[PDB]
Design an enzyme around this catalytic site. Sequence first.
Site, PDB file in Angstrom:
ATOM      1  N   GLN A 255       0.709  -1.218   0.072  1.00 47.94           N
ATOM      2  CA  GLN A 255       0.126   0.132   0.121  1.00 47.94           C
ATOM      3  C   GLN A 255       0.831   1.357   0.019  1.00 47.94           C
ATOM      4  OE1 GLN A 255      -3.013  -1.032  -1.075  1.00 47.94           O
ATOM      5  NE2 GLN A 255      -2.329  -2.927  -0.608  1.00 47.94           N
ATOM      6  N   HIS A 258       1.166   3.206  -3.271  1.00 52.18           N
ATOM      7  CA  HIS A 258      -0.260   3.802  -4.110  1.00 52.18           C
ATOM      8  C   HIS A 258       0.416   5.285  -4.163  1.00 52.18           C
ATOM      9  CE1 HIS A 258      -3.536   1.222  -4.662  1.00 52.18           C
ATOM     10  NE2 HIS A 258      -3.209   0.694  -3.387  1.00 52.18           N
ATOM     11  N   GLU A 323      -7.874   2.081   7.247  1.00 55.42           N
ATOM     12  CA  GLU A 323      -8.618   1.536   6.254  1.00 55.42           C
ATOM     13  C   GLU A 323      -8.606   0.098   6.074  1.00 55.42           C
ATOM     14  OE1 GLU A 323      -7.085   2.506   2.293  1.00 55.42           O
ATOM     15  OE2 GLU A 323      -9.163   2.414   1.292  1.00 55.42           O
ATOM     16  N   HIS A 324      -7.283  -0.315   6.220  1.00 54.79           N
ATOM     17  CA  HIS A 324      -7.015  -1.991   6.047  1.00 54.79           C
ATOM     18  C   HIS A 324      -6.190  -2.304   7.281  1.00 54.79           C
ATOM     19  CE1 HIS A 324      -7.316  -0.398   1.698  1.00 54.79           C
ATOM     20  NE2 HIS A 324      -7.891  -1.564   1.560  1.00 54.79           N
ATOM     21  N   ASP A 357      -7.819  -5.963  -2.232  1.00 55.97           N
ATOM     22  CA  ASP A 357      -7.635  -5.248  -3.094  1.00 55.97           C
ATOM     23  C   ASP A 357      -8.315  -5.449  -4.787  1.00 55.97           C
ATOM     24  OD1 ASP A 357      -6.560  -3.485  -1.320  1.00 55.97           O
ATOM     25  OD2 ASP A 357      -4.662  -3.349  -2.223  1.00 55.97           O
ATOM     26  N   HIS A 416     -52.326  14.813  15.751  1.00 56.35           N
ATOM     27  CA  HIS A 416     -51.879  13.382  15.410  1.00 56.35           C
ATOM     28  C   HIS A 416     -53.026  12.311  16.425  1.00 56.35           C
ATOM     29  CE1 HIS A 416     -48.220  15.323  14.428  1.00 56.35           C
ATOM     30  NE2 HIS A 416     -47.458  14.080  14.173  1.00 56.35           N
TER      31      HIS A 416
END
Lengths: 431, 432
Positions: A255, A258, A323-324, A357, A416
Amino acid sequence: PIKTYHLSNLTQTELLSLKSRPRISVFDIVNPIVDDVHAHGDAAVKQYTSKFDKVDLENIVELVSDLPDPVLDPAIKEAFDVAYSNIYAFHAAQKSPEKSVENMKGVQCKRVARSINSVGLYVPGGTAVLPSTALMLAVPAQIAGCKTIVLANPPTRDGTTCKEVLYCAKKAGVTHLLKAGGAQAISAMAWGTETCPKVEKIFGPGNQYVTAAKMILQNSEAMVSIDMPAGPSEVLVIADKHAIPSHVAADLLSQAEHGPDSQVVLVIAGDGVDQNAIQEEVSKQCQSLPRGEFAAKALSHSFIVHARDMLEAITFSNMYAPEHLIINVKDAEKWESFIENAGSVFLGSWTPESVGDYASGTNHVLPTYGYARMYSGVSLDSFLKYITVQSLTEEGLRKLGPYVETMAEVEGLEAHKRAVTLRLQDIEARQ
Amino acid sequence: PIKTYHLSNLTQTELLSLKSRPRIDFSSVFDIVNPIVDDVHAHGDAAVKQYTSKFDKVDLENIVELVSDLPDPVLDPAIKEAFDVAYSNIYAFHAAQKSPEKSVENMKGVQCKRVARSINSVGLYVPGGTAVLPSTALMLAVPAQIAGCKTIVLANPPTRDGTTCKEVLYCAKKAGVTHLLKAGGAQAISAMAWGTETCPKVEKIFGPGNQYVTAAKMILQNSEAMVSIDMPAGPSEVLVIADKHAIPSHVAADLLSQAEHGPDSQVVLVIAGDGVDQNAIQEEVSKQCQSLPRGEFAAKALSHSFIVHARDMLEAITFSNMYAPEHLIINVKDAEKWESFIENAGSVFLGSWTPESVGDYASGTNHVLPTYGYARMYSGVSLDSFLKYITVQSLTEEGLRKLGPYVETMAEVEGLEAHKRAVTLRLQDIEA
Ligand SMILES: N[C@H](CO)Cc1c[nH]c[nH+]1
Ligand SMILES: N[C@H](CO)Cc1c[nH]c[nH+]1
Ligand SMILES: [Zn+2]
Ligand SMILES: [Zn+2]
């Protein structure tokens, strides 16, 4: 070498600093783009597409039906078909049975699912090849039954969109291809144009200009929602003394490549871990990577935390909300009940994040930045609304109605109350 | 008289304009609300107190109290019995939404699952001032309670005299609310989103409110505060579809039930097919409204409400789906058979004995629902609103040997060699 912290030592202030990713302004440049596409349709989209992308297109939206099926090498086709297959099965399994709850006899209530009618999916383009993302987004849309599915993917410099993305788009039922990117693409989807359908919800990470357009447009008169903030990718790896250092290193790098803003965190749980060997493996493996400069930059703000045990290590991860999360520890599966905040989790020694992924079946469109504390990753439910339905018999109204009158009187809401009273009178007057 | 339209007469522009609610454009509200939010962000409890003094007419030393420290109020027995019934029905309906967490194993040795975990800290906005809304306290607190949220902050502006009403407090106690924030407005939303010296910072903020509260929510979801929200849940709306079998006084009472919430509420009647006496519904509305305590509010809501004639049920429900109402009452023959045609609606009430009042109060469904047309893409509050669903996967060696080659191929196509090598390195060590 990578910065190391000892978890027991960390003050509240240092911990808060550790959980905060590099900070975020953008809104100033984006609004005129938004407003312009709103006001002047396709023509403005093309102007921003010439300026930013250097491409002159006459047809910026294609019906995917009208496009020929791309020509793929058979190994590539086969792999994408495996990914489709797994993602499809995993998402199809999320369908909810819809059962009546009838606690009080004659008071019947249910929750039913309906698809969001029109959705837009943003997948980065130009030189980017992200067929994986195209599948993560379009497969659940397909399953949910969305009528219009617009996929925004900016073309290559010669007017043509990545063929692997097109392949995936056709397999997953994308209806319209919006050959455009950036804030112009988002606005086109949120507002609709001459040839772009208007969508109700926009999915998919992109650049600062995309995220900004999405955030502005969700609060606008466009009437659109979005999936989440899903910024620079992140991975947190928990490793104990049984993890293979070169595999730990490879997962961190998977990662970090990226981009230079990616964040990678290693939590060493317990004794006997060879941190020197891990560090050594990271440097060597990074040097031989095509994207090693991005990865080296991402690692320059990555860090190692030592935790006394697995319970402390998971406690740190829960604060961080990655995230992961990769848990490369002995009996990793047993720790599942202690995980609170993580977009997606990878258990054991044979489960690199790369599998999620790409083709395990889980969705890689996930909350970053800490947003996994309150958002889920994209799923079938992201493409659905759940409508509640109730129906009472006369008897049901006789049992429940008086309670309702009581409560309404308490709130000072006599109308009501009377919607019930008038009906109860009518029921009595025939009974 | 309520304004009338015939669908078959209208142009596309005309038809589309009936989607509009009587609400301000969001940017005008953001200007009113932004400085309040930033004020609370910068200055904490002092700012909140200042707003509460100015607008709620009350000087509070403690703007946040721990619910465990507050006395258990005593409620008239009938009132207590009614709230306990609502609690019980809302609890049962929401508890039944728990998902089984079954493993999927398409390919052997590739196991994946989705698991639910609660949002740790939540803020619940209960409107107040001259509104007493213990019902909303249950709609919000009960699902938080079932999900397991650890910190539950309930915000509720003090009433005219300057007190949180006791029924709200009863409901908060029964549903495990942890803190009471004795403020309202955008300053309440900001205090929860940012945290204050005594207000817990929450991860997600829920609940219905006026145009300003709603705008505060929407603003803060884009902020650096790190907060999400349930939805835009503004002034109540009801659309009623009625046929010739509907009793006109019941149709009028339904419209009025929600008109009375406030001047910015909107009510729509869609007449489906022939045989409906619209004049009887109109007279009944007028007569009923004149006898209502809040008839003034109701008359003002009715001034932007309208009647639509549809040739049949298909066209009626097509129109409703465009409007996308918070609440839909289908008072037609065989109402249940039309359920499959319903596409955009927060909550639906089927048949002649199902006034919206019952879902507002005690049927068990949730009344915190999207307004303005947001039913197009948001759901009402549910158990899931208080949960994250984490995906989890685990591969055996066999699983990785089978799947990993496909992954390498895809990573090669995307130009992501480090993703490929996290598989290759494992597979090589297997083969060695
Ligand atoms: N790791 C990214 C965020 O989940 C997804 C991805 C695509 N291709 C490679 N990785
Ligand atoms: N009709 C409101 C929005 O669903 C809920 C409510 C509470 N008390 C009376 N009505
Ligand atoms: Zn990745
Ligand atoms: Zn109501």
